[PDB]
Amino acid sequence: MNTVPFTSAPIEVTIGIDQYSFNVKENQPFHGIKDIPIGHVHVIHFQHADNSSMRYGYWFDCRMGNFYIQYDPKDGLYKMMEERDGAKFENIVHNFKERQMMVSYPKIDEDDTWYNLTEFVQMDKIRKIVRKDENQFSYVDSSMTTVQENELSDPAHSLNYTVINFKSREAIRPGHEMEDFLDKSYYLNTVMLQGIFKNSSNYFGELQFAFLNAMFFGNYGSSLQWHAMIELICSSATVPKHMLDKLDEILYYQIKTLPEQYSDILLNERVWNICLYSSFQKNSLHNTEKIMENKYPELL
Amino acid sequence: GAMNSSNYAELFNNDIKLFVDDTNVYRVTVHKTFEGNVATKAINGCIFTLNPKTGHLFLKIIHTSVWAGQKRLSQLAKWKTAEEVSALVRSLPKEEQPKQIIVTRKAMLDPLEVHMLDFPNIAIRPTELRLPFSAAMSIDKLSDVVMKATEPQMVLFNIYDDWLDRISSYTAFSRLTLLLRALKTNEESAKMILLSDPTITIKSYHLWPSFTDEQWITIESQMRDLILTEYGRKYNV
Numbered sequence: 366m367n368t369v370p371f372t373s374a375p376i377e378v379t380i381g382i383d384q385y386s387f388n389v390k391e392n393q394p395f396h397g398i399k400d401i402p403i404g405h406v407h408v409i410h411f412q413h414a415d416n417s418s419m420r421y422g423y424w425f426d427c428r429m430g431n432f433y434i435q436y437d438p439k440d441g442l443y444k445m446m447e448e449r450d451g452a453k454f455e456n457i458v459h460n461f462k463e464r465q466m467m468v469s470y471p472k473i474d475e476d477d478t479w480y481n482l483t484e485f486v487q488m489d490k491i492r493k494i495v496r497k498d499e500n501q502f503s504y505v506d507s508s509m510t511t512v513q514e515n516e517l518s519d520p521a522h523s524l525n526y527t528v529i530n531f532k533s534r535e536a537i538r539p540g541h542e543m544e545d546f547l548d549k550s551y552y553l554n555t556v557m558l559q560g561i562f563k564n565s566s567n568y569f570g571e572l573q574f575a576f577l578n579a580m581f582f583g584n585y586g587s588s589l590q591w592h593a594m595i596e597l598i599c600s601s602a603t604v605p606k607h608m609l610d611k612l613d614e615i616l617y618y619q620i621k622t623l624p625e626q627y628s629d630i631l632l633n634e635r636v637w638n639i640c641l642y643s644s645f646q647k648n649s650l651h652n653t654e655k656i657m658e659n660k661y662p663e664l665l
Numbered sequence: 666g667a668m669n670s671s672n673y674a675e676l677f678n679n680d681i682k683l684f685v686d687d688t689n690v691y692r693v694t695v696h697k698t699f700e701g702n703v704a705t706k707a708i709n710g711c712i713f714t715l716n717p718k719t720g721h722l723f724l725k726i727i728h729t730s731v732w733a734g735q736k737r738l739s740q741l742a743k744w745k746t747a748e749e750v751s752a753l754v755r756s757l758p759k760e761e762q763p764k765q766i767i768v769t770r771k772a773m774l775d776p777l778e779v780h781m782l783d784f785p786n787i788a789i790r791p792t793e794l795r796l797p798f799s800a801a802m803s804i805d806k807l808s809d810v811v812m813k814a815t816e817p818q819m820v821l822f823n824i825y826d827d828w829l830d831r832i833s834s835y836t837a838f839s840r841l842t843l844l845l846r847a848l849k850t851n852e853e854s855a856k857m858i859l860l861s862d863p864t865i866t867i868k869s870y871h872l873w874p875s876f877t878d879e880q881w882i883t884i885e886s887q888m889r890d891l892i893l894t895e896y897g898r899k900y901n902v
């Protein structure tokens with residue numbers, strides 16, 4: 366079990382760690398989060414009490430280094446940092462634990478939610494979508510735009526998701542215009558899976574990361590990416606059976622975790638109605654269709 | 666953006682553009698079978714592709730053999746339309762290619778956009794105008810070449826005859842849309858108006874009769890009367 370030490374908490378802030386959150390008061394003696402499960406990526410995120418604008422946070426994996434949070438009064442945010450002196454970091458954490466100034470990652474033993482949301486998410490792939498090679502962790506916030514959004518303005522601060530565009534030469538083989546537009550199997554299986562992602566695990570990892578950035582930061586370009594990657598599968602008549610079964614599980618847990626009060630903005634009516642009721646895969650997502658109909662029948 | 670009443674004069678500027686109407690591409694008769702079920706029999710169709718500035722008509726005849734063994738024909742017809750329009754554009758010299766293609770039915774937007782991906786600078790636009798181009802098969806010479814075709818064939822006609830020698834494109838398009846609207850609303854009456862006087866003939870290379878300027882004014886008034894009436898006879902007013 367790993368730990369992320371905070372220097373201090375000088376400004377009042379709601380701190381999230383994965384799907385959990387807690388409020389910290391201005392100058393409250395808070396010194397970080399312990400008992401973080403090893404084996405998964407994690408995200409630690411922030412919303413200041415004064416400016417609910419800009420949710421922001423850091424994707425990280427404690428197996429890759431010792432990370433801590435320290436507030437910067439100049440840039441006005443809680444920053445993640447790496448401590449390279451392992452003995453300096455073990456000593457700091459040990460003292461804070463002895464003084465019981467850390468909250469414990471509040472995982473219930475029966476609960477596989479975070480695993481299910483991050484099953485295919487890898488830190489190495491996150492670091493290619495979010496390019497800042499000098500750090501082992503990745504910053505994301507509400508406002509960052511995607512490469513595709515930019516093409517349609519600072520490249521260093523963009524989300525480099527894989528561009529998917531159904532009306533593009535990459536998606537449409539000359540001479541197969543109607544075939545490829547109405548059945549996207551060649552774009553899914555040859556262009557994207559065999560060509561770009563290499564395998565379905567990397568495809569699902571980007572899909573899962575896009576959803577999590579949409580949910581935790583309200584990142585609009587990430588929501589677009591998540592829906593595009595769903596629609597590309599559902600609009601393919603030919604999809605490996607293991608991928609369809611896995612997609613149903615992935616989406617089920619995403620829909621299960623989504624805050625009810627955010628479904629209006631985070632769920633695209635056209636995509637979901639098309640995918641569950643019109644698409645080639647309308648009968649292949651049984652768990653997802655059941656949870657959607659019982660939790661968000663209005664959208665449908 | 667969409668072409669509408671507000672930006673109508675854009676049709677007659679010097680940027681080459683084409684209307685595409687797919688109404689008459691997939692044409693059928695519905696009939697009963699011996700067992701008493703219903704079936705369709707395709708008849709030859711056409712793509713109506715028109716330069717509204719010059720009157721240039723590129724009438725691509727769609728022979729019934731293109732439907733043989735195919736499913737979902739109404740969907741296929743839109744894609745076949747887009748394939749043929751794209752092939753026409755590629756066949757034209759660069760300086761004769763359109764800068765915009767205006768589709769008369771919004772369901773043609775995605776098929777045409779996908780077929781024209783190689784031409785990113787040609788704008789594909791819908792329209793809010795309810796244009797009467799479906800009535801093109803009420804023009805006798807056009808209907809005749811479509812029905813007689815035994816294979817796929819492109820036939821080039823000027824739909825304005827020689828009108829542009831005496832009137833502007835705006836006035837020519839307005840006359841064409843008036844004639845076609847009349848033919849669509851009451852074909853028999855419209856055709857009676859156009860042919861009532863036997864001494865005004867249709868030249869061999871023309872589609873419409875050789876009316877003088879004064880006779881076109883009378884004809885146009887007759888077509889407007891017909892359209893207003895039928896709008897009574899229909900709504901009882």
Ligand SMILES: NC(=O)CCc1c[nH]c2ccccc12
Pocket residue numbers: 370371372432433434435448453454457
């Ligand atoms: N004691 C300090 O130097 C505060 C900042 C700091 C440096 N390295 C760290 C490692 C873990 C937590 C905090 C820190």
Ligand SMILES: NC(=O)CCc1c[nH]c2ccccc12
Pocket residue numbers: 720721722723757761821822823
């Ligand atoms: N290629 C073009 O730009 C026009 C071709 C064309 C179609 N219909 C016509 C009628 C009269 C002269 C020319 C034509």
